[PDB]
Design an enzyme around this catalytic site. Structure first.
Site, PDB file in Angstrom:
ATOM      1  N   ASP A  77       0.854  -1.071  -0.129  1.00  0.00           N
ATOM      2  CA  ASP A  77       0.137   0.131   0.029  1.00  0.00           C
ATOM      3  C   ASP A  77       0.991   1.186  -0.099  1.00  0.00           C
ATOM      4  O   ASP A  77       2.116   1.073   0.291  1.00  0.00           O
ATOM      5  CB  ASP A  77      -1.225   0.004   1.062  1.00  0.00           C
ATOM      6  N   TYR A  79       2.806   4.741   0.749  1.00  0.00           N
ATOM      7  CA  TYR A  79       3.302   5.422   1.737  1.00  0.00           C
ATOM      8  C   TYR A  79       2.407   6.206   2.456  1.00  0.00           C
ATOM      9  O   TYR A  79       1.602   6.870   1.586  1.00  0.00           O
ATOM     10  CB  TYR A  79       4.701   6.127   1.410  1.00  0.00           C
ATOM     11  N   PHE A  90       6.756   2.137  -4.213  1.00  0.00           N
ATOM     12  CA  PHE A  90       8.182   2.579  -3.763  1.00  0.00           C
ATOM     13  C   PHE A  90       8.562   4.009  -3.969  1.00  0.00           C
ATOM     14  O   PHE A  90       9.520   4.580  -3.203  1.00  0.00           O
ATOM     15  CB  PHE A  90       9.181   1.536  -4.277  1.00  0.00           C
ATOM     16  N   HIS A 202      12.265  -9.141   0.059  1.00  0.00           N
ATOM     17  CA  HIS A 202      11.575  -8.018   0.149  1.00  0.00           C
ATOM     18  C   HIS A 202      12.806  -6.807   0.574  1.00  0.00           C
ATOM     19  O   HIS A 202      13.592  -7.257   1.590  1.00  0.00           O
ATOM     20  CB  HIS A 202      10.648  -7.782   1.049  1.00  0.00           C
TER      21      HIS A 202
HETATM   22  O1  LIG Z   1       4.363   2.213  -2.333  1.00  0.00           O
HETATM   23  C1  LIG Z   1       4.915   1.367  -1.671  1.00  0.00           C
HETATM   24  N1  LIG Z   1       5.844   1.766  -0.972  1.00  0.00           N
HETATM   25  C2  LIG Z   1       6.552   1.015  -0.136  1.00  0.00           C
HETATM   26  C3  LIG Z   1       6.209  -0.220   0.136  1.00  0.00           C
HETATM   27 BR1  LIG Z   1       7.191  -1.405   1.355  1.00  0.00          BR
HETATM   28  C4  LIG Z   1       5.225  -0.747  -0.718  1.00  0.00           C
HETATM   29  O2  LIG Z   1       4.920  -1.893  -0.678  1.00  0.00           O
HETATM   30  N2  LIG Z   1       4.689   0.235  -1.666  1.00  0.00           N
HETATM   31 BR   LIG Z   2      10.057   1.643   3.703  1.00  0.00          BR
END
Ligand SMILES: O=c1[nH]cc(Br)c(=O)[nH]1
Ligand SMILES: [Br-]
Length: 242
Positions: A77, A79, A90, A202
């Site tokens: 999901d 941040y 990410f 991960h």
């Molecule tokens: O958008 C995201 N940012 C960081 C992570 Br960890 C993620 O699963 N999704």
């Molecule tokens: Br993170």
């Protein structure tokens, strides 16, 4: 054409609008897309701050060329701090500190990809623009509350549907990067005969030293693309963000 008031209209790129139409359709899961919208409306009515802003919810699609799609990277999901997520897994907006997972992605890029230079910012939009779909399973979150929409929003069913529909119907063969157990659950949605699935541990610190560092997923992704006659990813990011 979706009867939603606003949610479907946030998909602005015409190729993606057309491709995703059977999922955003009212008929998909008998009104499920509308129920996602209604959920988000109700959370707003309750005074909850939902991220990212509406205009970025579908940025993974809007910024990624449909006909050029070649890599799919899954996240969990968004941040959850203000002014941080912007609709790509990410990635963070410029002028925000790098989250730990992203630091570790940069570390691995530095050792894996000869000559890669990590920027100080975390803005990954230039990857999306090359044909990399940076899709979170859950596309919204309440401020400061990790996972807050994962069980309640209905997004995961939507994005699961997207993954399956890409697997079955996208014109291109694709490389799926599945990092961590959550993402790896989606392998069963993907035709691993037609597409290439590259699984790794991960990059978050809890797992990173147990298989992330040294995994060379970025070079492996490019080797896969090259074998499929695709243009490889250009992993270097602009050192100045827009
Ligand atoms: O958008 C995201 N940012 C960081 C992570 Br960890 C993620 O699963 N999704
Ligand atoms: Br993170």
């Amino acid at each position: 054409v979706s009867s939603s008031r606003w949610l479907a209209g946030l998909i602005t790129n015409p190729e993606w609008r057309d491709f995703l139409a059977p999922i955003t359709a009212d008929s998909w899961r008998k009104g499920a897309f509308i129920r996602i919208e209604r959920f988000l409306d109700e959370e707003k009515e309750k005074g909850r701050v939902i991220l990212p802003p509406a205009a970025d919810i579908f940025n993974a699609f809007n910024s990624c060329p449909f006909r050029g799609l070649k890599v799919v990277l899954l996240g969990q999901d968004p941040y959850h701090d203000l002014h941080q997520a912007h609709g790509l897994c990410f990635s963070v907006l410029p002028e925000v500190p790098l989250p730990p997972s992203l630091r570790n992605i940069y570390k691995e890029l530095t050792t894996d990809i000869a000559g890669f230079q990590a920027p100080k910012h975390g803005y990954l939009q230039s990857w999306s623009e090359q044909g990399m779909l940076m899709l979170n399973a859950t596309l919204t979150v309440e401020a400061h509350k990790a996972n807050s929409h994962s069980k309640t929003s209905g997004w995961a069913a939507f994005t699961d549907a997207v993954i399956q529909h890409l697997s079955q119907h996208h014109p291109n063969r694709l490389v799926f990067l599945l990092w961590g157990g959550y993402a790896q659950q989606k392998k069963r949605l993907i035709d691993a005969n037609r597409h290439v699935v590259l699984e790794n541990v991960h990059p978050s610190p809890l797992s990173a030293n147990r298989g992330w560092f040294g995994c060379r997923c970025f070079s492996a992704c490019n080797e896969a693309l090259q074998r499929m006659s695709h243009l490889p990813m250009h992993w270097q990011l602009p050192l100045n963000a827009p």
